[PDB]
Structure formats: C-alpha cells, structure tokens
Amino acid sequence: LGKFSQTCYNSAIQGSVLTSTCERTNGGYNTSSIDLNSVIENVDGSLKWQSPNFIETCRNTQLAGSSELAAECKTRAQQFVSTKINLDDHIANIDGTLKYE
Amino acid sequence: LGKFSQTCYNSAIQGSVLTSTCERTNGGYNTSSIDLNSVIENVDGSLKWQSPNFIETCRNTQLAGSSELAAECKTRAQQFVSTKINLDDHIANIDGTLKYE
Numbered sequence: 613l614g615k616f617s618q619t620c621y622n623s624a625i626q627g628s629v630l631t632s633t634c635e636r637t638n639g640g641y642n643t644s645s646i647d648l649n650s651v652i653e654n655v656d657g658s659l660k661w662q663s664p665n666f667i668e669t670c671r672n673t674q675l676a677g678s679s680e681l682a683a684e685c686k687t688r689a690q691q692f693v694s695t696k697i698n699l700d701d702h703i704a705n706i707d708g709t710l711k712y713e
Numbered sequence: 714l715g716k717f718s719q720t721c722y723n724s725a726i727q728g729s730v731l732t733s734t735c736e737r738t739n740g741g742y743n744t745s746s747i748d749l750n751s752v753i754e755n756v757d758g759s760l761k762w763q764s765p766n767f768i769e770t771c772r773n774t775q776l777a778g779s780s781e782l783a784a785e786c787k788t789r790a791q792q793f794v795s796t797k798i799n800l801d802d803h804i805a806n807i808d809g810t811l812k813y814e
C-alpha cells in the first residue's frame with residue numbers, strides 16, 4: 613500500500629494537507645492534494661493511522677433502545693466482547709437530516 | 714451536541730448505517746441515513762467516538778524528507794512531544810492523483 617513518494621515530486625505539507633506532483637500512467641504529470649486530517653489521529657502524542665472502520669472488527673450491530681449502537685467487537689486479543697455507544701452523543705437532527713457534529 | 718433521538722422516530726441500524734425519520738423545523742418529517750463506520754472506532758473491544766482531527770491537537774506540521782509527516786503533538790498530559798509518521802504507508806499515487814488506501 614501507498615508508496616506515492618516513488619513517482620511524485622515537489623511534495624509539501626501545509627496544515628493537514630499533502631500536495632504533490634505525480635506521474636500519470638499515460639505520460640505526463642498531475643498535481644493533486646489530499647487532506648490527512650481524518651485518516652491520521654493523535655494518540656497520546658504520536659501520530660497514528662486512523663483506526664479501521666468498526667464494521668471490520670465488530671458484528672451483530674443493533675440499535676439498543678432509542679439511541680444506542682450495540683455490537684460485539686473484537687479485542688486486541690482477538691476475543692469478542694459486548695459494547696455499546698450512545699449515538700445521541702454526536703448524531704444530531706439538523707432540520708430533518710441526520711448529521712454528525 | 715447530538716440528541717437526534719428526541720425529535721426522530723422509526724430509527725434502525727443495519728451494518729454501519731443509522732436511518733431515522735426526523736422532524737423538520739418547518740413542519741413535516743424527513744427520512745435520512747448516516748454511515749457511522751468512520752466516525753466510530755473499535756478500541757480494544759469498545760466502541761469509541763473516532764478521534765478528533767489531528768490538527769486540533771498538533772502544531773508545526775512539516776514534510777520531513779520525502780514522505781514523512783512530522784509535528785509536535787499534545788499528549789493526554791497536555792505536553793507537546795515530537796512525532797512523525799510515514800505517509801508512504803497509506804498514501805498512493807493512483808494515475809497521477811493522491812489517494813488513501
């Protein structure tokens with residue numbers, strides 16, 4: 613995965629955004645940008661790649677009660693345990709549409 | 714923040730997606746969906762809200778060498794330490810455009 617640096621040049625980082633000029637398969641180059649803010653997290657001082665989608669390591673997702681998401685999720689030890697989270701924490705109803713905030 | 718459940722009904726969760734029918738400010742209801750996969754993470758078995766954008770708790774971001782993102786990031790103890798991450802880990806050059814994978 614990755615390896616962009618091997619076929620790109622003039623890379624730069626401003627804030628959360630990486631910009632670089634990269635080689636196209638069909639000759640020629642293209643300059644593009646990517647915002648790393650959401651795919652990179654700060655964990656107790658060290659930059660780590662954002663954790664994988666939870667559906668990759670959790671099963672049997674259900675709505676518990678009126679606003680809780682419940683599931684059986686894998687521990688680092690590879691064992692499934694019960695867990696839940698209140699979606700009312702961050703999911704809002706903004707004029708009829710569900711929005712994260 | 715949040716509190717969608719107080720003005721919505723017929724909520725349901727399928728996989729990573731929450732769907733609910735919510736009250737509009739201007740009378741009437743609207744049914745909408747939101748995918749929780751990326752805003753909820755599995756940390757050692759418990760569902761936690763995905764960590765905040767790293768630019769919120771990190772400063773002085775720079776490109777170190779050809780592919781590393783370097784910065785000074787806040788620890789849980791509120792002290793800034795040096796950290797870096799190799800963007801070649803997950804940032805690819807897909808036919809001239811930077812893409813995460």
Ligand SMILES: [Ca+2]
Pocket residue numbers: 677678679718721722723724733
């Ligand atoms: Ca509900």
Ligand SMILES: [Ca+2]
Pocket residue numbers: 682683684694695696
């Ligand atoms: Ca549970």
Ligand SMILES: [Ca+2]
Pocket residue numbers: 617620621622623632778779780
């Ligand atoms: Ca580079």
Ligand SMILES: [Ca+2]
Pocket residue numbers: 783784785795796797
């Ligand atoms: Ca550093």
